[PDB]
PDB file of C-alpha atoms in Angstrom:
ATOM      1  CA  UNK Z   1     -56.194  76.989 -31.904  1.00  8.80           C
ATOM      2  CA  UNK Z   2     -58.509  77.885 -34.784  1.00 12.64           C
ATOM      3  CA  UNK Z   3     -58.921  75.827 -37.811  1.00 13.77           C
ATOM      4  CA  UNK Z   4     -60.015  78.645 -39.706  1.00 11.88           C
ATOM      5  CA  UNK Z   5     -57.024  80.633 -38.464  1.00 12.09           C
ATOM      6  CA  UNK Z   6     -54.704  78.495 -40.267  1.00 11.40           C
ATOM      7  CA  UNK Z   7     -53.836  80.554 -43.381  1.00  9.97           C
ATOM      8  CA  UNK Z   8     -53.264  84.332 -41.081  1.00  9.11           C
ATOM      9  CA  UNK Z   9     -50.927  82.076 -39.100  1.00  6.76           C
ATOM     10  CA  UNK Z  10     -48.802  80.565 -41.891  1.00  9.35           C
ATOM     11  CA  UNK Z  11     -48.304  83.683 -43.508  1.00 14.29           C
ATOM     12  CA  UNK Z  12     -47.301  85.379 -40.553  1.00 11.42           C
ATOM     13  CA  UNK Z  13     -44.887  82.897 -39.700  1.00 13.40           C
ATOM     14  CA  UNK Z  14     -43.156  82.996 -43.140  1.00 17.38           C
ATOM     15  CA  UNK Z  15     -43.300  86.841 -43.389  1.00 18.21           C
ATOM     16  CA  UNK Z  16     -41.932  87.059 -40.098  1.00 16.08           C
ATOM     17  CA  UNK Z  17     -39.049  84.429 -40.689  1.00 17.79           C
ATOM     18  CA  UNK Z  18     -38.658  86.136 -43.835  1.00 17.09           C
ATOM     19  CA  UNK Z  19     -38.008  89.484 -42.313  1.00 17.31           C
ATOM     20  CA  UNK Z  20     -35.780  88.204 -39.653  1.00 17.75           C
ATOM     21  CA  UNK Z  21     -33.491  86.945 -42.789  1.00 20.12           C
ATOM     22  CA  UNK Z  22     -32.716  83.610 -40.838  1.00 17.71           C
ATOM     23  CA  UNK Z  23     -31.918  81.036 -43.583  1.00 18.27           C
ATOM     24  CA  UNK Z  24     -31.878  77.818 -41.357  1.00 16.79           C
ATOM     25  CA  UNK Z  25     -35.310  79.147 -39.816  1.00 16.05           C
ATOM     26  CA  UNK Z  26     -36.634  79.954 -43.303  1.00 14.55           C
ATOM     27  CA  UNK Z  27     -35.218  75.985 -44.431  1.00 13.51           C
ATOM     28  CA  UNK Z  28     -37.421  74.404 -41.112  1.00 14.25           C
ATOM     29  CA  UNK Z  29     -40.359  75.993 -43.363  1.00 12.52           C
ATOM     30  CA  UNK Z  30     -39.356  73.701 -46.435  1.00 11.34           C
ATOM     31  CA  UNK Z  31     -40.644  70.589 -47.679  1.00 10.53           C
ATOM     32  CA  UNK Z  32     -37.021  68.821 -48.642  1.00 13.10           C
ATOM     33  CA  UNK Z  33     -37.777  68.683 -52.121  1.00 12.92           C
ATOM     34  CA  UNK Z  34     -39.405  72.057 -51.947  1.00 12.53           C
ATOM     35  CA  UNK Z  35     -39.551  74.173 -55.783  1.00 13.41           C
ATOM     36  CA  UNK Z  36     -38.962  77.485 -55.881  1.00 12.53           C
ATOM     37  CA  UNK Z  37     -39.963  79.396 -58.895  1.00 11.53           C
ATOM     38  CA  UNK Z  38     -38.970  83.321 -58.780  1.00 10.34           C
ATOM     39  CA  UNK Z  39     -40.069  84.557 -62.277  1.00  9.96           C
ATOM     40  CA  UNK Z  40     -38.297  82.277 -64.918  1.00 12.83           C
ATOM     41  CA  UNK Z  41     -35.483  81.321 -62.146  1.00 12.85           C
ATOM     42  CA  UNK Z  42     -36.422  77.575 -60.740  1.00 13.10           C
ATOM     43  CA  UNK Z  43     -34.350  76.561 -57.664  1.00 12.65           C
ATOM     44  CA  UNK Z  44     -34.971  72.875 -55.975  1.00 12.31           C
ATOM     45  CA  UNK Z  45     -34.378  71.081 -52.696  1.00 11.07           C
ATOM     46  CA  UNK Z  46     -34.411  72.803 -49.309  1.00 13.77           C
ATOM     47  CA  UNK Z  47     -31.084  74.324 -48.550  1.00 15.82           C
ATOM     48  CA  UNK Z  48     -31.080  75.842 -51.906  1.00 16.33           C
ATOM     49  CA  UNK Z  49     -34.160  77.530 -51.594  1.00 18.01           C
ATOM     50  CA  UNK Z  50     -34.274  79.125 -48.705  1.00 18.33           C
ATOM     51  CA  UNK Z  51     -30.419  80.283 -49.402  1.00 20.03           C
ATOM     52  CA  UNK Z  52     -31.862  82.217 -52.006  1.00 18.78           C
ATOM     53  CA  UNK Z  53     -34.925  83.296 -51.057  1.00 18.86           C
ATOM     54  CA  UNK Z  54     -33.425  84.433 -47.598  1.00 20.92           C
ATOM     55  CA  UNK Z  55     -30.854  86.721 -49.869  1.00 20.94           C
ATOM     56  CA  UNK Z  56     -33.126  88.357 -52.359  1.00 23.43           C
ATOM     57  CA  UNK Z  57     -35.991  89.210 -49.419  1.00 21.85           C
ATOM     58  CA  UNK Z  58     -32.737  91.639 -48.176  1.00 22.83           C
ATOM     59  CA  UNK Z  59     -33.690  94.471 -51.013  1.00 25.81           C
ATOM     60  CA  UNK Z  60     -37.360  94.496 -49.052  1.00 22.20           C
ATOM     61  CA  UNK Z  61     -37.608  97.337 -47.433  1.00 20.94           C
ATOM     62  CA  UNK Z  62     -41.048  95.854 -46.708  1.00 21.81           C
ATOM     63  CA  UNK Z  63     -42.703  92.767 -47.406  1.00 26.05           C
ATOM     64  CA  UNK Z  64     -46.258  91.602 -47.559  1.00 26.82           C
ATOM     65  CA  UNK Z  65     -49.061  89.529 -48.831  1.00 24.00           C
ATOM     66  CA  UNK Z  66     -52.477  89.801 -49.619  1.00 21.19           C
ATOM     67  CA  UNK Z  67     -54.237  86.351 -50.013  1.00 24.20           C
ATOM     68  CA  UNK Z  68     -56.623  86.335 -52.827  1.00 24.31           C
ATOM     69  CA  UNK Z  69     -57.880  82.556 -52.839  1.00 20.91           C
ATOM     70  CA  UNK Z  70     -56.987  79.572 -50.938  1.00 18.97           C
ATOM     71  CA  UNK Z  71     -57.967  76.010 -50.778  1.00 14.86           C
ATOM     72  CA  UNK Z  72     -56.783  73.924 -47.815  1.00 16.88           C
ATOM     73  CA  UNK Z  73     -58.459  70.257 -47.369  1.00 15.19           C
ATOM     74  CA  UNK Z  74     -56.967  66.782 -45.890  1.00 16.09           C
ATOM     75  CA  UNK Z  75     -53.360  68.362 -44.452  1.00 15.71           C
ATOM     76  CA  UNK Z  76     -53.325  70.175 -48.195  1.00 17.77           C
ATOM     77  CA  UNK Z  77     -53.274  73.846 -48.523  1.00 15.47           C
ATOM     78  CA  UNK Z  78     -52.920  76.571 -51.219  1.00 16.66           C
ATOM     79  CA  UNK Z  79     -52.637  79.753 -51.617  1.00 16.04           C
ATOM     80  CA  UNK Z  80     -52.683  82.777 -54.580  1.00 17.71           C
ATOM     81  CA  UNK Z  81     -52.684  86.272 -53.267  1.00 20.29           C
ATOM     82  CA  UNK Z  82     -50.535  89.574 -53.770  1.00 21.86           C
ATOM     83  CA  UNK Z  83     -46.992  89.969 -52.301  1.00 23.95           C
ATOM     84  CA  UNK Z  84     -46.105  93.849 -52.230  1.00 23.49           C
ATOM     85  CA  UNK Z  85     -42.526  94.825 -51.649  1.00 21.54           C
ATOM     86  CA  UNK Z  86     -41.428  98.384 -51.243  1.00 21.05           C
ATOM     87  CA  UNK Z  87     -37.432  99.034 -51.770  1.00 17.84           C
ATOM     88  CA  UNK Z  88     -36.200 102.942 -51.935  1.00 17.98           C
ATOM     89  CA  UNK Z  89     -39.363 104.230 -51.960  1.00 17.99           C
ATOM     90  CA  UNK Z  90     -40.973 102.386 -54.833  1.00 16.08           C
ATOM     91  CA  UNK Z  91     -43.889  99.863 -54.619  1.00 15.20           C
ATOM     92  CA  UNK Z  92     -44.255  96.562 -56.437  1.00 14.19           C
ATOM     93  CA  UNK Z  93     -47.350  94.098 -56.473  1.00 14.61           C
ATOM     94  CA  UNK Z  94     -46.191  90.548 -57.702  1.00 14.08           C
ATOM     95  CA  UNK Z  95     -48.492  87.416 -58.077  1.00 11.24           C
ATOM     96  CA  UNK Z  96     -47.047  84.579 -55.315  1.00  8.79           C
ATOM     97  CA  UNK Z  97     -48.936  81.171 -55.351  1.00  7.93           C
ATOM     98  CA  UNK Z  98     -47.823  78.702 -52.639  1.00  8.82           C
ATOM     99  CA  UNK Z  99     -48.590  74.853 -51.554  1.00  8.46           C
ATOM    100  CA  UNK Z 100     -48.042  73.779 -48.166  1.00  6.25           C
ATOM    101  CA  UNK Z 101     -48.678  70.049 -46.671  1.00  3.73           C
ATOM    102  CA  UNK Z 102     -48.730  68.860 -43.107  1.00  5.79           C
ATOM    103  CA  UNK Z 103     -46.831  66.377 -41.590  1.00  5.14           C
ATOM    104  CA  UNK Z 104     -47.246  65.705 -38.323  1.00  2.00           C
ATOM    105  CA  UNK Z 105     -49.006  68.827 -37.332  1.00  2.00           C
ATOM    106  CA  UNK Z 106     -46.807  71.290 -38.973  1.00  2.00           C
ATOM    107  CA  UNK Z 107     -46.699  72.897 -42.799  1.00  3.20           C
ATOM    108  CA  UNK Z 108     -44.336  72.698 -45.138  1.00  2.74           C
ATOM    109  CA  UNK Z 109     -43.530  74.342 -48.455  1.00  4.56           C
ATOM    110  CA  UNK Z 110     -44.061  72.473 -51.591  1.00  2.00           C
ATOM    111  CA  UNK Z 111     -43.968  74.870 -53.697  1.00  2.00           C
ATOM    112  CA  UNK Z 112     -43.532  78.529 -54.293  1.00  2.00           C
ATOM    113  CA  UNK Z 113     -43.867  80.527 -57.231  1.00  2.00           C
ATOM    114  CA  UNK Z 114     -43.372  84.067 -57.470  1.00  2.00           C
ATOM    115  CA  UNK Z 115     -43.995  86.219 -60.315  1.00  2.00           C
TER     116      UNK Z 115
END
């Protein structure tokens, strides 16, 4: 139950959910009118996203992320770091920025854009 710990435990979360490759667990993450931006690809609303996000994160062998900066304030939180996926041996470092807001003590997903 620490403030501070807030960022460690979203990303866990997601990666975690992520990993599992549950789509309706990955859409309880998602702001309704979440965007997803995956390089010049933009996909909108909830069950959208997290269809396609759950499908692509299937080619990671493994998935992280490295946060670089983040700014959370008044139930408002964002985040820029380094994801790193690994698939068939091969290791790629991608730029992921992501906005979460709270509603009624749990985050939600915004935004996303990868790449």
């Amino acid at each position: 139950s620490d403030e501070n710990d807030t960022a460690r435990k979203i990303i866990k979360t997601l990666l975690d959910i992520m990993r599992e490759g549950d789509e309706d667990k990955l859409r309880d993450q998602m702001d309704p009118n979440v965007r997803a931006d995956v390089g010049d690809k933009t996909v909108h609303g909830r069950e959208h996203a997290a269809k396609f996000l759950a499908h692509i994160v299937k080619r990671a062998d493994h998935i992280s992320f490295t946060l670089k900066s983040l700014h959370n304030h008044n139930g408002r939180l964002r985040m820029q770091g380094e994801v790193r996926i690994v698939h068939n041996g091969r290791t790629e470092r991608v730029p992921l920025e992501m906005v979460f807001r709270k509603h009624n003590g749990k985050w939600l997903i915004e935004r996303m854009k990868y790449g």
